[PDB]
Amino acid sequence: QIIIAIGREFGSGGHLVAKKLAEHYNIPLYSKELLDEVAKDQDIAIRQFNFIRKKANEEKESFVIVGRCAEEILSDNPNMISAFILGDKDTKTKRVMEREGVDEKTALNMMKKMDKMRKVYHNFYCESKWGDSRTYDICIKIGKVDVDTATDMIIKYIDSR
Amino acid sequence: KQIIIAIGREFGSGGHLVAKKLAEHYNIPLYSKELLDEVAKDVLERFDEKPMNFAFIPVQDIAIRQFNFIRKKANEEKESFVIVGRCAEEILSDNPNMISAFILGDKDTKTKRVMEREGVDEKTALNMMKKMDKMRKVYHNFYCESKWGDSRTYDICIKIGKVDVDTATDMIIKYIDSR
Amino acid sequence: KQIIIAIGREFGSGGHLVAKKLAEHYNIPLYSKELLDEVAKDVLERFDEKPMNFAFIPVQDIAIRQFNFIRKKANEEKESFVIVGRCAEEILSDNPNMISAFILGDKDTKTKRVMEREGVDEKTALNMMKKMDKMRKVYHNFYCESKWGDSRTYDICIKIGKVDVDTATDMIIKYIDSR
Amino acid sequence: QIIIAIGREFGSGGHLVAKKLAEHYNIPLYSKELLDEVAKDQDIAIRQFNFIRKKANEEKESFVIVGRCAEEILSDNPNMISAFILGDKDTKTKRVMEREGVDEKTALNMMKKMDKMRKVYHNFYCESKWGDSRTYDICIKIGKVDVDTATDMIIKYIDSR
Ligand SMILES: [Cl-]
Ligand SMILES: [Cl-]
Ligand SMILES: [Cl-]
Ligand SMILES: [Cl-]
């Protein structure tokens, strides 16, 4: 019924958006952590993809999923929408210092390493490019605006289909 | 300026219609390549704005004049406006009153809009779409270091398809007004 | 044609000198943008050559004429020549007598060659290099689907720096003659 | 004295070039296989990089190395040269069917997957782009010419510095 695939730059507030959306529609939030557990029955990746596909296509469940190539995997399911959440450098830096209790220099390095890792993971499995507007239905930069605004824009999008 | 909206777009996406709808909602002018072709056709310039410095490097004069029109209207006259294309999100980088949005669509939706707009068949529609998009990407990536169509180049990107032009316009207005 | 050599290059790399040295070694003409500006300035064309089909899509006439000059000289007149730039490796794709080579250099080497060539300082040299390279990349990637400067676009790429122009030229000749 | 860093598209003949060059100069051929062994004293990657660096910079050894970001790692060692070996699609296909005893369809899929994996590995650790001419001193497409010709062009390059 509603599947929301969330991509995000590290420290942009993408998890907070994902969660707020899941609370709004009262549906589950799936992540890497959950899928890691729930698929011990690159090999890992096939199991996770096939799981997201079960839930989407056959079980017809509603959920939010962060990452996991979900927008590529769920690509012909007419009930899923995707969004990529980004942020201002300074907004992200503060979010990552706070969450991880680290200094500025290290925050910035974590951001760069994590965004490289996401990009690599996504672009290996998908033909589309991580972070490019064509890969998603909506992209929102959090900075000029706050997480709640991003979340509401996404619900508007979804509620108006 | 008080509100400046810089719109980029894929050909056929409905991006002009969104730009128009926004200009009407806020009752401000809509500037385009067409208008700048007119009003921008008549040493101090190193405001360290990348497209201009780049334009100046020895080896279009038109491009500079248009950039400078846009920069003056935004920064010196403090006018509010909508500007489509023309590297405006890059030029007006340092202006904290500027928002930018990239409008895109799915193939079917765009091809339908283009055939209908241009009295053309599917084949042609899709060729036009690819040419104009390459054209805009080339113009943009020549003058800017950021990448045409990349989410990081903009504040908002909205794909028109699952949602219509009115829904995209409303979402841009919400972004703007909640800032 | 019997031998056709299509040369691409970074600005300042020594690529014109290699093209010249090759043309002299094989005693064939050296065609450039300059010459094509002259000799190529005066319906059948869908030889399914990508740059031409792309050029034809409705929305440069010059570009078509130059592509067609190159294509005719290669394929119909069977002439041997060196051609710098002008998308020649793409245009002459199907001609099994064509080799292509991309010439590049390290920064120091290029900046030195450019300052000396253009009576210019370091700062300017490096700005020129970046502008011309963006210019060539844009021209090339607009008309072709392959990527300017990517090794897959060419048969050979040689960085001039650790080795001189004579060494690069010899290596291209070895490639050609051992085929 | 001489360090040769070899990159390559899967099935292009890059290993055969690397080996022939090592025989020519009578120096060792290091690969992933060797480095895998010789560095149990992404964590793995640091150990391998630091090993290549020892051999290069401190021990001053001569060698050929395939892959392993060697051109990036050995970047200010004025005695190393890099080359990227590529191939014609049809030449590569036959080389991979023969070596791996597989059909055409599968050869082509192996090529695509292996080239994606190399690209990802390289582009994660390096700032330069796998396969781009600027990343290397020489790039050669084997197809119009054979492995021995590629190998000789590289020796010319090296011998003329
Ligand atoms: Cl992501
Ligand atoms: Cl645009
Ligand atoms: Cl070129
Ligand atoms: Cl490699």
Side-chain angles (χ1 to χ4, degrees), chain D residues 67-115:
Chain D
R68 301 286 96 194
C69 304
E71 89 297 340
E72 184 82 13
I73 296 318
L74 288 190
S75 199
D76 190 40
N77 176 316
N79 304 315
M80 90 89 165
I81 85 129
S82 57
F84 189 74
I85 309 289
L86 331 63
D88 167 82
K89 186 153 182 191
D90 295 356
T91 304
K92 297 189 294 186
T93 299
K94 264 113 67 157
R95 186 178 291 97
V96 175
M97 300 169 182
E98 188 190 358
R99 293 209 298 239
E100 318 286 339
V102 303
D103 70 9
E104 184 163 22
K105 296 157 171 151
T106 78
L108 285 164
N109 288 332
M110 287 181 58
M111 282 156 58
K112 190 196 170 189
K113 182 173 206 215
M114 294 298 299
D115 288 346

Side-chain angles (χ1 to χ4, degrees), chain A residues 82-149:
Chain A
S82 57
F84 189 74
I85 309 289
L86 331 63
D88 167 82
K89 186 153 182 191
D90 295 356
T91 304
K92 297 189 294 186
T93 299
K94 264 113 67 157
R95 186 178 291 97
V96 175
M97 300 169 182
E98 188 190 358
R99 293 209 298 239
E100 318 286 339
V102 303
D103 70 9
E104 184 163 22
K105 296 157 171 151
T106 78
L108 285 164
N109 288 332
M110 287 181 58
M111 282 156 58
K112 190 196 170 189
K113 182 173 206 215
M114 294 298 299
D115 288 346
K116 277 212 145 170
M117 293 184 211
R118 271 72 184 276
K119 188 187 156 187
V120 151
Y121 163 75
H122 186 271
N123 291 359
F124 179 72
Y125 293 109
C126 304
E127 306 205 30
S128 64
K129 294 180 184 165
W130 187 80
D132 187 66
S133 67
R134 287 142 278 178
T135 307
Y136 313 90
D137 295 315
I138 327 172
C139 308
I140 305 174
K141 195 175 281 174
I142 284 168
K144 279 167 181 164
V145 311
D146 70 12
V147 169
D148 285 341
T149 305

Side-chain angles (χ1 to χ4, degrees), chain B residues 111-172:
Chain B
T111 101
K112 251 155 298 189
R113 162 161 10 244
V114 172
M115 297 169 69
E116 193 162 339
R117 163 198 305 164
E118 297 293 40
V120 87
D121 71 3
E122 179 186 13
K123 176 189 182 157
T124 306
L126 265 104
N127 284 343
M128 270 175 278
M129 284 156 51
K130 156 195 183 190
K131 189 134 183 199
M132 294 296 316
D133 291 343
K134 282 184 93 191
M135 231 155 72
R136 276 155 197 193
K137 168 168 164 165
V138 151
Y139 164 77
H140 187 275
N141 297 351
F142 181 68
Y143 291 104
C144 313
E145 294 176 341
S146 63
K147 297 294 168 191
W148 183 82
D150 180 24
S151 63
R152 293 144 276 165
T153 301
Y154 313 92
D155 297 320
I156 317 170
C157 300
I158 306 173
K159 183 174 293 177
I160 293 199
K162 302 184 178 143
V163 297
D164 66 19
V165 179
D166 271 45
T167 292
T169 303
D170 288 345
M171 295 171 63
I172 290 165

Side-chain angles (χ1 to χ4, degrees), chain C residues 35 44 53 56 60 72 82 91-92 95 111 116 139 150 163 175-176:
Chain C
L35 190 153
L44 322 49
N53 301 303
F56 285 118
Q60 278 107 60
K72 281 183 182 193
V82 178
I91 294 176
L92 296 178
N95 194 308
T111 101
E116 193 162 339
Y139 164 77
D150 180 24
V163 297
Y175 187 96
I176 295 164

Side-chain angles (χ1 to χ4, degrees), chain B residues 7-10 84-87 102 136-137 140 148 154:
Chain B
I7 282 161
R9 92 249 85 144
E10 304 181 324
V84 172
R86 303 286 88 187
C87 301
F102 186 79
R136 276 155 197 193
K137 168 168 164 165
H140 187 275
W148 183 82
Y154 313 92

Side-chain angles (χ1 to χ4, degrees), chain A residues 7-42:
Chain A
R8 70 317 185 194
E9 300 187 326
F10 187 73
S12 55
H15 169 76
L16 294 175
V17 171
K19 181 164 161 148
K20 282 183 167 148
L21 289 161
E23 288 158 16
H24 186 258
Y25 292 106
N26 201 28
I27 63 186
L29 175 51
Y30 306 151
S31 70
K32 187 196 154 60
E33 175 196 359
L34 195 145
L35 301 168
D36 278 353
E37 213 50 57
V38 189
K40 301 170 196 181
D41 283 14
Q42 172 158 25

Side-chain angles (χ1 to χ4, degrees), chain C residues 36-65:
Chain C
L36 282 179
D37 285 342
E38 288 310 307
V39 212
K41 184 202 295 203
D42 194 334
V43 191
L44 322 49
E45 289 184 20
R46 170 154 37 82
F47 294 71
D48 299 343
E49 291 169 35
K50 296 197 150 70
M52 289 193 31
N53 301 303
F54 187 76
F56 285 118
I57 302 164
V59 153
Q60 278 107 60
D61 288 347
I62 289 175
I64 285 168
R65 304 191 168 217

